[PDB]
Structures are given as structure tokens and as C-alpha cells.
Amino acid sequence: DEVWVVGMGIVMSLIVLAIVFGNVLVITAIAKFERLQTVTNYFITSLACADLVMGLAVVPFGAAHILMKMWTFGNFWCEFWTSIDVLCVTASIETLCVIAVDRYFAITSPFKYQSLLTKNKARVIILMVWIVSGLTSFLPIQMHWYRATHQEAINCYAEETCCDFFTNQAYAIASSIVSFYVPLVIMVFVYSRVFQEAKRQLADLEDNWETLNDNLKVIEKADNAAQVKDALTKMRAAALDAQKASPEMKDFRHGFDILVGQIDDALKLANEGKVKEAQAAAEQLKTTRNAYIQKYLKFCLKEHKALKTLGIIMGTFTLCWLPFFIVNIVHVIQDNLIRKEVYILLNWIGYVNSGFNPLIYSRSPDFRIAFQELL
Numbered sequence: 001d002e003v004w005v006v007g008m009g010i011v012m013s014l015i016v017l018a019i020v021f022g023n024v025l026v027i028t029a030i031a032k033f034e035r036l037q038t039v040t041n042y043f044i045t046s047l048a049c050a051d052l053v054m055g056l057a058v059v060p061f062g063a064a065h066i067l068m069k070m071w072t073f074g075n076f077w078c079e080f081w082t083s084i085d086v087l088c089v090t091a092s093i094e095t096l097c098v099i100a101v102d103r104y105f106a107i108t109s110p111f112k113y114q115s116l117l118t119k120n121k122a123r124v125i126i127l128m129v130w131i132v133s134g135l136t137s138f139l140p141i142q143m144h145w146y147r148a149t150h151q152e153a154i155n156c157y158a159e160e161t162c163c164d165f166f167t168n169q170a171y172a173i174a175s176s177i178v179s180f181y182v183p184l185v186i187m188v189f190v191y192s193r194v195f196q197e198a199k200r201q202l203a204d205l206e207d208n209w210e211t212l213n214d215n216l217k218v219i220e221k222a223d224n225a226a227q228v229k230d231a232l233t234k235m236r237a238a239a240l241d242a243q244k245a246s247p248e249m250k251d252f253r254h255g256f257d258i259l260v261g262q263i264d265d266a267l268k269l270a271n272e273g274k275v276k277e278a279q280a281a282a283e284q285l286k287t288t289r290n291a292y293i294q295k296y297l298k299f300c301l302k303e304h305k306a307l308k309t310l311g312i313i314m315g316t317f318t319l320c321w322l323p324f325f326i327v328n329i330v331h332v333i334q335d336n337l338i339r340k341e342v343y344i345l346l347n348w349i350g351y352v353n354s355g356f357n358p359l360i361y362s363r364s365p366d367f368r369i370a371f372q373e374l375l
């Protein structure tokens with residue numbers, strides 16, 4: 001008893017401070033800096049604000065309730081506590097779904113994400129998500145929908161006792177489906193499509209830079225300047241195609257301008273060149289692609305890091321909250337399987353998850369620099 005009452009208190013307090021500190025840093029980095037201020041970062045700010053509300057008005061009260069013997073704030077301020085608890089989870093999972101949809105709308109069809117998905121549209125989307133979550137969270141709790149249809153619990157709904165959820169079958173199933181299981185399917189499908197499509201765009205650019213290496217390696221330094229025209233004609237077309245398909249747009253466009261100019265110098269205007277400049281210009285092309293791989297690999301690595309960073313967050317959320325939501329479905333199909341010991345523990349797993357988001361953000365170099373220049 002003596003060891004538990006202090007160890008649990010220390011653990012919960014450390015979790016509270018970790019959640020508040022991390023989410024405050026994540027919010028401040030977006031809200032104060034200018035380098036990282038975009039629609040995806042606006043959605044990140046919405047998620048961080050939801051998790052901050054979870055760490056402020058949900059986690060400490062649940063910790064006090066589990067640490068103490070009974071509620072203390074009254075029969076009211078317990079409906080609000082549960083409402084805010086459900087709202088934070090719903091507005092986190094739906095914000096994650098919006099993030100996945102956004103990262104699908106900016107990898108599949110660009111030139112529209114920079115024209116329609118503006119700051120005003122991002123604000124509208126996050127407001128819509130928050131209002132939808134509020135409508136599906138507060139309204140059932142604030143009235144008789146969440147009440148249980150049996151008399152053992154009714155003692156804990158009044159007379160200033162208890163704050164346990166006491167799930168009723170209909171509301172439990174409806175909330176576990178609408179709030180979590182519906183967003184967790186659209187979310188997973190959309191993000192899996194994003195990963196299936198991102199590889200394709202990388203593959204399209206990789207092969208465009210393959211039809212140049214074998215072109216340069218095989219045809220240029222063999223013979224018959226006539227076919228050097230054929231290789232260079234193929235080289236120009238593939239270079240132009242890659243050029244046709246954030247400093248990325250500026251840097252890549254100017255980079256391909258140099259490559260095309262070098263290609264034209266290799267094509268010359270007084271042909272029969274053979275050795276005097278066709279091979280000499282070919283060697284310079286070898287420097288160009290050797291100095292382009294560095295930029296191209298850096299960008300591909302950055303995207304495969306940025307996407308996997310969001311993949312970890314969308315994976316950490318599932319691996320933390322799904323164990324709880326797979327138990328709520330058990331409590332309705334057949335009771336007496338789980339007592340109120342691992343139900344609290346599995347629930348508290350999702351509570352801890354609110355602090356894992358800022359640590360995952362530190363993996364991204366863009367966020368890490370903002371964190372360092374803020375502490």
C-alpha cells in the first residue's frame with residue numbers, strides 16, 4: 001500500500017508533465033516559427049492541442065480518481081470530464097485521418113494542394129473535425145444515451161458516488177464504431193494507398209535516371225558518332241521528361257536547365273564530332289549526375305523519413321488505443337471476462353500515448369531544429 005500510493009502518483013505526475021511539456025513545445029514551434037508553418041503543420045497543431053487538452057483536463061483527473069478512493073469534484077464536472085475525454089480521442093483520430101487524406105491530396109494531385117488547401121481551408125477543415133467530434137462526443141454524454149439499462153450501476157450515477165463509465169450496449173457499440181473503428185479504417189486504407197503511390201513516383205524518377213546511365217555508359221564511349229546522336233537524342237528526351245515531372249521546385253528546375261544545356265552542347269551544331277567534344281561533353285554529364293544523386297537521394301530520403309514519421313504516429317496511436325477499444329467490444333458481447341483492473345490499465349495505455357507524439361516529431365530534422373532553438 002505504502003509503495004503503490006507513491007509510485008503510482010509519481011508515474012502519473014511524470015506522465016502529466018511529459019505530456020504538457022511535449023505538446024506545449026510542439027504547439028509553440030508551429031505557432032512561433034515561420035520555417036514550419038503549413039497545412040500539414042496546422043493539422044499537427046490541432047492534434048497537439050487535442051493531446052494537450054487530454055493531458056490537462058483528462059489525465060490528471062483520471063489519475064486522481066484511480067489514486068483516491070472515490071470522486072471529489074461532484075456529480076457534475078464528471079460528465080464534462082468524460083465528455084472531454086471522449087472528445088480528445090475522437091478529435092485525435094479524426095485529425096489523423098485528415099492528415100492521411102491531406103498527404104494523399106499532396107502526393108497524388110499536386111498543383112491543387114497549393115491552390116485549394118490554403119490556411120483558411122485548413123482552419124475550416126480542423127474546425128469541421130472539432131465540431132463533428134464535439135457533436136458525436138458531448139451530446140451522447142450530456143444526456144440519457146450513455147446511461148446503463150441495469151440497476152447496479154444506477155447507484156453510481158447519483159448520490160455523489162462513482163464516475164466509472166458503465167457502458168450500455170447500444171452506446172458502447174455505436175461510439176466504438178463511429179468514433180474509432182470508422183476513422184481507423186479510412187485512415188489505414190488512405191495511408192496504405194499513400195505508401196503504395198509514393199514508391200511509384202520514386203520509381204518513375206528512378207527509371208528516368210536509369211535510361212540515362214546505361215545510355216551514357218554503353219553508347220557514348222564505344223564508336224560511331226551517329227549512334228551518339230541516338231543516345232543523346234534519347235538523353236535529351238529523358239532529361240526533358242524528368243524536368244516536366246518549398247525549394248524543391250526551384251532547385252530541381254534550375255538543375256535540369258544546366259543538364260539540358262550540357263546535353264545540347266553534346267549534340268553540337270557541327271556534327272561528326274566523335275572524340276573532340278562528344279566524349280568530352282559526355283564526361284561532364286558524368287559529373288552532373290554524380291552531383292545530382294546527392295540532391296535526389298536527400299529528397300527521397302527526406303520524404304521516406306517524413307512519411308515514415310507520420311507512419312509511426314499513425315501506428316503508435318493504433319498500437320496504444322486499439323487494445324482498449326478491442327476490450328470495450330468484449331464487455332458488451334459477454335461480461336465477467338475483464339474486471340476493473342486491466343480495463344483501467346488498457347485504458348491508461350491510450351492516456352500515455354498523448355506524450356509519445358512530440359518524441360516522434362523529434363525524429364524529423366525539421367522539428368528537432370525548432371525544438372533545439374526553443375529550449
Ligand SMILES: C=CCc1ccccc1OC[C@@H](O)CNC(C)C
Pocket residue numbers: 082085086089090165172175176179180328347
Ligand atoms: C467506448 C468507450 C468510450 C470512448 C469512446 C470514444 C473514445 C474514447 C472512449 O473512451 C476512452 C476513454 O476516454 C474512456 N474514458 C472513460 C473515463 C473510460
